[PDB]
Design a binder for these strands. Structure first.
Ligand SMILES: [Fe+3]
Length: 202
DNA sequence: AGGTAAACGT
DNA sequence: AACGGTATTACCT
């Protein structure tokens, strides 16, 4: 048990990974990866894009979900069926049979790239979990608690691993340590992560 | 009266 | 290099 409400499902997406990676390439050929700039003016080391009906984005004013890619001025690409199917099966296996994501943020890590501890809290309906799928190079995941200083668990996430948090762990701090260089036959020299969220409704 | 943004030194 | 300060404020609404 990763924490109350939280599971790691090791190698859960390993058989779906080839198709997932083809579809990430397709998503990116419409809304390219870009390193976004925080409100305070720093360029993130992780490159990002989104698919689905809502996409996570930084603004001068803060963070937000938008139906429009602000770089292309066009809707984000539709969420691929391969993504939505894997998400629905991982959710179900982790105990969240009703999750309906309408947003998928896609992170790409080059060697050196990191994601500092943060909370996912931009979603209006905190009852829905987050589903996180890992592809390519391995990375160390930090998973804390409700307070930034709460002790961290560190876990290696390998190609195909899926983590799901929700309920009591929904607002826990988490992040990614600087990516080590290396080789993966499917991604060559990077790691991808797909994070599914329910970002609309109410 | 409340909610947000946060990505250098030891 | 793991931990924790910083937002301990200054803006919105
Ligand atoms: Fe996150």
């Amino acid at each position: 048990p990763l924490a109350a409400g939280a599971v790691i499902l090791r190698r859960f997406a390993f058989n779906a990974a080839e198709q997932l990676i083809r579809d990430i390439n397709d998503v990116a050929s419409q809304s390219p990866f870009r390193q976004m700039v925080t409100p305070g003016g720093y360029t993130m080391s992780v490159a990002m894009t989104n698919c689905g009906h809502l996409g996570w984005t930084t603004h001068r004013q803060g963070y937000l979900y938008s139906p429009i890619d602000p770089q292309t001025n066009k809707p984000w690409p539709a969420m691929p069926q391969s993504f939505h199917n894997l998400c629905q099966r991982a959710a179900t296996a982790a105990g969240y049979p009703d999750f309906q994501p309408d947003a998928c943020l896609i992170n790409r890590y080059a060697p050196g790239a990191k994601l500092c501890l943060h909370q996912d809290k931009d979603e209006p309906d905190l009852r829905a979990p987050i589903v996180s799928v890992s592809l390519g190079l391995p990375a160390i995941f930090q998973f804390g608690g409700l307070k930034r200083n709460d002790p961290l668990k560190r876990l290696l996430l390998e190609h195909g691993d899926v983590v799901v948090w929700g309920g009591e762990s929904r607002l826990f701090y988490h992040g990614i340590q600087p990516l080590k260089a290396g080789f993966h036959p499917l991604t060559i020299d990077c790691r991808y992560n797909l994070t599914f969220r329910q970002a609309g409704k109410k």
